[PDB]
Amino acid sequence: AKVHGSLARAGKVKSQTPKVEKTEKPKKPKGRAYKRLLYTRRFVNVTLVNGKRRMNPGPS
C-alpha cells in the first residue's frame, strides 16, 4: 500500500481535548481493608431489581 499520508494531524485529538485535573477524595483503605469493604457492599442488602444485580449502578 501507499506510504504517503497526511501526518499533520498526528496527535490531533490528544491536544484539543480539555485538560482538567483529578479530584482529591477520602483515602481508599488498601489490602485486607479493601477486601473487607468489597465484601460489605456486595453481601449485605443493596442490589438492582430482578434476579440479576448491577455492581456499578449508573445514576438514573
Partner: protein
C-alpha cells in the same frame, strides 16, 4: 483394523509414519527447519533494537478506514528494512529521522496486526525511554 498397523513387532512403520507426517503443523516446521534463524527480520528474538528511516502514512484496509502513522526502520544487527507501527494517540512526533528505538512484535506472531498491511512490529522504547511513559506524561525525553 483402522488403517494403521496394530502389529506388536511393527514399531518402525509407526514411528517413521509419524515422523513423515509431523511435517504439517506450524510449530514443528518453524522449529526443525531453522526458519526463525535463517529467514525473517529478527533473529528469532523477542525485541530487536533499531534506528529509523522515515515516518509513514499507511493506508489502512476496509472496513477500518484511517491513516496509521508507522515508521520505516533499519535495524542494527542485520540491517534489514522493516516497517513498524507506533502505538497510542499522537506520539509520532516524539520519534524523528535517525533515533535509537527498541521494537517489539505485535502479539500475533508474524503477519499483520489487524488492519495494517505489511507491518508486523510495534515499538517499545525510543532513546531508551518507553513510548508508554511519554504518552502518559511521566518521564522526559532526552534531547540527544
Amino acid at each position: 483394523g483402522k488403517g494403521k498397523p496394530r502389529g506388536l513387532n511393527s514399531a518402525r512403520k509407526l514411528r517413521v509414519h509419524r515422523r513423515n507426517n509431523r511435517w504439517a503443523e506450524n510449530n514443528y516446521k518453524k522449529r526443525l527447519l531453522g526458519t526463525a534463524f535463517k529467514s525473517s527480520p529478527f533473529g528469532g528474538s523477542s525485541h530487536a533494537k533499531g534506528i529509523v528511516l522515515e515516518k509513514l502514512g499507511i493506508e489502512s484496509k476496509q472496513p477500518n478506514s484511517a491513516i496509521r502513522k508507522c515508521v520505516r526502520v533499519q535495524l542494527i544487527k542485520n540491517g534489514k528494512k522493516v516497517t513498524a507501527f507506533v502505538p497510542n494517540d499522537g506520539c509520532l512526533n516524539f520519534v524523528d529521522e535517525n533515533d535509537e528505538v527498541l521494537l517489539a512484535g505485535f502479539g500475533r506472531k508474524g503477519k499483520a496486526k489487524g488492519d495494517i498491511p505489511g507491518v508486523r512490529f510495534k515499538v517499545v522504547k525510543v532513546s531508551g525511554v518507553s513510548l508508554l511513559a511519554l504518552w502518559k506524561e511521566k518521564k522526559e525525553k532526552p534531547r540527544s
